[PDB]
């Protein structure tokens, strides 16, 4: 189905004169495969997947050099932004960068992203057309003018439409056993009387890939949507994910409530009830 | 693969 490749970068200034922290991670769809950590003893781009280990030494050297270049760019950006916002050198701040490309199942270019944030707020982002920028405040406008004068959006367009898609296809082929797989959810429902007349039903879906999944509660044929305790999709640590959703129901009325499950690995949607 | 271009200081 639809596929995507995205890179995430986090750089944190640490209060004092200490070497700032830098962590880079790479994902194909919902599977992590590369990482870099400035506090690690390797100081190289490391693999976190079986199929990415087959790449040659020139690949790892180039990735190491490029991720180091990202790290140094963020090193400069911390002080630069600190000066932009008149912040003190006694505090700790954070720069975040994310970029990648999404395809439309047929492995053709669909979307491209490059976003940049200082602390936890948006700073600047490349628009959909990959030729214009969105600046958040009046210093991000200075950065925006600088990047327009240097034609950054053109280079990022060339990467997002060209190299990103090529290597996304190459990654999808190498390790097709893992990336192009689909794990069906293993589900069950639990009933708990919170009091004498009280009840609540938890709908559990486990060990599914990809992470996109839909669990909803329906009462007497119509969806409730708002009356539920839905949690964020979480990883199990083995490449699969878990998700559950609870609903409050009166005792003896558990059969009014049904749980509907939708996932790629299920050719037909599923419906569960308190059996 | 990482981007070898388009990474400019703010």
């Amino acid at each position, epitope marked *: 189905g639809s596929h995507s490749m995205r890179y995430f970068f986090t750089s944190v200034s640490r209060p004092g004169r200490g070497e700032p922290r830098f962590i880079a991670v790479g994902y194909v769809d919902d599977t992590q495969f590369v990482r870099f950590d400035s506090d690690a003893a390797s100081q190289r781009m490391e693999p976190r997947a079986p199929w990415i280990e087959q790449e040659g030494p*020139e*690949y790892w*050297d*180039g*990735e*190491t*050099r*490029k991720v*180091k*270049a990202h790290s*140094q*760019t963020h*090193r*400069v950006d911390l002080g630069t932004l600190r000066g932009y916002y008149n912040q003190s050198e006694a505090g700790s701040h954070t720069v975040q960068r994310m970029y990648g490309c999404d395809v439309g199942s047929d492995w053709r270019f669909l979307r491209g992203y490059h976003q940049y944030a200082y602390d936890g707020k948006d700073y600047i982002a490349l628009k959909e057309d990959l030729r214009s920028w969105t600046a958040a405040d009046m210093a991000a406008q200075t950065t925006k003018h600088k990047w327009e004068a*240097a034609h*950054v959006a053109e*280079q990022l367009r*060339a*990467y997002l*439409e*060209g*190299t990103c898609v*090529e*290597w996304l296809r190459r990654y999808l082929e190498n390790g097709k056993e893992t990336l192009q797989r689909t794990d069906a959810p293993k589900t069950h429902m639990t009933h708990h009387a919170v009091s004498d007349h009280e009840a609540t039903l938890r709908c559990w879906a486990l060990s599914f890939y990809p992470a996109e999944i839909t669990l909803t509660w329906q009462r007497d044929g119509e969806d409730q949507t708002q009356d539920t305790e839905l949690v964020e999709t979480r990883p199990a640590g083995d490449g699969t994910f878990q998700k559950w959703a609870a609903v409050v129901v009166p005792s003896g009325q558990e059969q009014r409530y049904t749980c509907h499950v939708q996932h790629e690995g299920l050719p037909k949607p599923l419906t569960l009830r308190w059996e | *693969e*990482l*981007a*070898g*271009i*388009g*990474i*400019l*200081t703010v």
Partner: T-cell receptor
Amino acid sequence: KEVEQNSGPLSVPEGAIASLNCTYSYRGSQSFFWYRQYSGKSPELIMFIASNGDKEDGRFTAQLNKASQYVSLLIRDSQPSDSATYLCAVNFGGGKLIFGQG
Amino acid sequence: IAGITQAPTSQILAAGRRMTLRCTQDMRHNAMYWYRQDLGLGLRLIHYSNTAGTTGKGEVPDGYSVSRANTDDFPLTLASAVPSQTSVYFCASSWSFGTEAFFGQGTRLTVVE
């Protein structure tokens, strides 16, 4: 490392189309440059190319195919002032920009 | 206008002496490069520097020192000049790593015994 062009020297008569080529080792290369160096001068940037395909700059044309690790430059209406050493530069990630023999 | 400048453009050295080629650039470029060209080949990468404060070792780093104390300057230092270091040294600079590099005027350097 490993950037190699047509060794040369080559000869093209005045007014004709000339063609230079260049290959590299790193498949992940994403930016490529053609420079012009007269004897005793510094490299003057002719062109750059990043995306696959062709790019037109006046009399000069750049072609790039990452699938075979290939880049090339075509010159229309070869003028006597075009006689020079043409350099092929490939970026190998970061600041490791490698030039061919010219 | 803004550009890039090397200094000197010519220097003769007695083997054993020390000499530093200065290179500066005004146009707010982050990346800077030091190349060595021997006229029997093309130029090879001596050193590079992605940002101000950081440096990198390249294709031919043996025997050369560098420093990137600030954005504008990226000098190349030869500590113990040997006759095999006779070459033409070029400095370059670029906005970002991987972008187009702009060269200076060059430096014809000849070390004699």
